[PDB]
Amino acid sequence: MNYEEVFSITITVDKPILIGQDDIVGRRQLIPIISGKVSGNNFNGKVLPGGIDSQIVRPDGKCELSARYAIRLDDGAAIYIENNGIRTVPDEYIEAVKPNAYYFRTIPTFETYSPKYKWMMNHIFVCCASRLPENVLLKFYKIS
Amino acid sequence: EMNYEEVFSITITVDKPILIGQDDIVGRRQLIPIISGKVSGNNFNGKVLPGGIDSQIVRPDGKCELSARYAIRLDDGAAIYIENNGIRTVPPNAYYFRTIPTFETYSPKYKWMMNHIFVCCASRLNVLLKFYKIS
Amino acid sequence: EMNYEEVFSITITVDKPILIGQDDIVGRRQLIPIISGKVSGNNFNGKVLPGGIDSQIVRPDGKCELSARYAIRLDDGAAIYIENNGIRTVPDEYIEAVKSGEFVDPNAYYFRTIPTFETYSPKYKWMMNHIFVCCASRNVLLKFYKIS
Amino acid sequence: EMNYEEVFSITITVDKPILIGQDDIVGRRQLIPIISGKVSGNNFNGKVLPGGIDSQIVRPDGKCELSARYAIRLDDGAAIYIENNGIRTVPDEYIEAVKSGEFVDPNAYYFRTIPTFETYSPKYKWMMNHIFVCCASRENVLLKFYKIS
C-alpha cells in the first residue's frame, strides 16, 4: 500500500463550545476554527470562515470528530472538506479527556469546483493529526 | 393514519452565506452561520447556542440539499445538539422546504428526543422551523 | 399544518435473522434477508427485487436501529432503490422480551422510518425530491407517506 | 510519516450483479451478493457469513461508489460486522468499457475503500478504535486490510 503526502494544514481553533455531557452519550462540543494555513507542493492557501469541528467524547474516553470547513488556494480554487475521525488516549489520560499520547487519525472527503482539483473527489485520503496549544496540525495523504 | 405532534419551533437569524465555490457538476456550496435563534413550544423554550452552521449545496438542477449542525439550551438548563438534514426545491411561498432532524440529549427528561422520528417544516424569509414528533 | 399523502405500501416477507454478534455496549447485530414483497398503492404496483437486507442493531437499552437496502420493480418496468433507516422501540415492560425475542404484541411497538429513494426515470424523480416517512409493523407492513 | 500494518485479507466470491437501474445523471445501481469468502492473516483466520451485499453505483463519469455490508466469523468464534465504503475508478480510455461492462484489465483499476468495524469482544475492540484502509482488486475480489498507526 502506497500513499503520497499531498498537503498540511495548521489550524487555529477557538475555545470549545461545550453543549452537554452525561455518561450515556458522552460530552458534546463544537470547536470553532479561527484560521488555518494550508501548505504543500502546489497546494497553498488558507482556511475560510465558517469552520466547525463537532466532537463527542464517549464515556469510555474515545473522541469521535467530524469537521466541516473550506479552504481557498492562492490560485483561487476553493475546496470544501468534511473530515471524520477519531482520537483515543491511553488509560491514565482518559478522565482528563472527558499530546504524543493520542492516536489521532481521520478520513477527509473533498468537494471541488474545477477540473484541476477533480482528482480529490476520486481518491481515498487519510489524515494524520496532532493537537497543541489551540491549533491542530493535519497532514493529508492520498492513498495511491 | 400517520399521527404526529408539533413539539416546538425555532426562529433562526442567519448571517450572509459564506460562498465556497460553484460549478455545473456539483453545484454551489455555501456555509450559513446561525447568529441567533429563539426556541419556543409547550415546555420547550430557550435559545440557539453559538457555533451553528448550515452547510448547503445548490445542485445544478436547482435542488438545495441542507445539513445544519447546531445546539440549543433550554430555560430549564437542558442542552440539545441538533443535526438537521433536508431539502429545499423551487419550481418564498415557492419553496418545498422540509427536513429531518436528529437529536442528541444529556438528561433523562429529554431522552424521548433520541427515540422518535421527527419531521421539520421550514420557511425561508431568517428561517422558521416547526418540529413534529412522529407518533 | 403538516400535510402528507400516503403514496404506497409494501408487504415484505423476511427470512430468519442472521445473528452476527451481541454484547452489552454495542448491542445485538443481525442481518435480515428480504425474501419477497408486494408493492401496492394508487398507480404504484410492483414487487421487491432480489438482494434486500435489513441491517439491524438492538441496543442494550432495547432500541432497535434499522437500516434496509432493497429495490422494487414496478409493473411499468421502472425500478426504485430504497434505503430505509429508522427505529423500533417498545415500552419498558417489553424490553426483556425484545432482548430475548420472546413474543411481543405488535401494538406495543413504535416503528417508524425515513426512506431515501433513487429512481431512473422522469416519472419517478419526485421521489428523489420530497421528504418521506414510513409507518411499519409486524410479514412486515410498510406504509409510505410523502410529506407535502 | 504515515505508518500502517496489514491486518488480514479476505478473498470473496460474489454472485452476478442484481441490476436495479440506470440513467445518465445518477448512473447505474446494482446489488452484488457475496456468496462466500475466506479471511486470512496472522492470528486472523475465518470465513464470511451469509447476508452480504455490496451496493454499488457507477456514476455517469465512470466512477464506481461502493458500500458493502457483511460479516465474518473467526475461528475462535468471534464475529466482526463490516461496513466497507469506497471507490473504483479506471483511466479515461477504459471508461466506455466499464459502462457496457466490457473487460478491463485488473491493473487498470484504482480500487480503495475505508472499512468500519463492529465487534463484540474485548479481544477485537481495537478494530473499533483505529482507522483502516482497504486495498482491493479483481474470479474474486481480494481485499487487503491495513490498520493506520
For the residues of A67-85, what is the DSSP string, one character each?
EEEEEEETTS-EEEEEEEE
Q: Which residues of A touch B (CB under 8 A)?
A: 17, 19-22, 24-25, 28, 30, 32, 48-50, 52, 54, 56, 68, 70, 77-80, 111-114
Do A47 and A30 form a contact (C-beta atoms < 8 A)?
A: no
- Exposure class string for D123-147: b at 16+ Cβ within 10 A, else e: ebeebbebbbbbbbeeeebebbbbb
What's the rounded Cα separation, in Å, for the pair D57 and A21? 39
Residues of chain C whose C-beta is under 8 A from some C-beta in B?
A: 1-2, 4, 6, 63, 86-87, 89, 110, 112-114, 129-131, 133, 135, 143, 145, 147
Chains interfacing with D (3 or more CB pairs < 8 Å): A, C
**Widest distance between CA atoms in chain C:** 48
Rounded to an integer, what distance in angstroms lies between the CA atom of residue C9 and that of residue C11? 7
Determination approach: X-ray
Phi and psi at residue D14, to the nearest 5°: -115, 150
* Distance of alpha carbon C27 from alpha carbon C33, whole angstroms: 20
Question: CA-CA distance, B72 to B51, in Å (whole number)?
Answer: 10
* Residue A134, helix vs strand vs coil: coil
Mutation test of the interface with chain C: which of D18, D22, D36, D81, choosing the one with the most C Cβ atoms within 10 A? D81
| Measured distance CA(A65)–CA(A13) in Å, rounded | 14
Question: Where do runs of H (alpha helix) occur along chain C?
Answer: 95-100
Q: What whole-number distance in Å separates Cα of residue A4 and Cα of residue A22? A: 41
In B52-126, where do the E strands start and end?
Answer: 53-58, 64-74, 79-89, 96-105, 118-124
- From residue B103, give the alpha-carbon distance in Å to each of A27, B100, C32, D30, D53: 14, 10, 27, 33, 30
Torsion angle in degrees (nearest 10) through CA of C69, C72, C78, C81: -10
Half-sphere exposure in the Cβ direction for D126 (13 Å, CA): 8
Cell of A47: 482556511
Domains in chain D: ranges and CATH: 1-149 (2.40.160.20)
Contact B34, B49 (CB under 8 A): no
* Residues of D at the C interface, defined by Cβ within 8 angstroms: 18, 20-23, 26, 29, 31, 33, 49-51, 53, 55, 57, 69, 71, 78-81, 118-121
- Give Dmax (Cα) for chain B: 47
In Å, how far are D114, D115, D125, D132, D147 from D144, measured between CA atoms? 11, 11, 20, 10, 10
Other C-beta atoms within 10 Å of A142: how many? 17
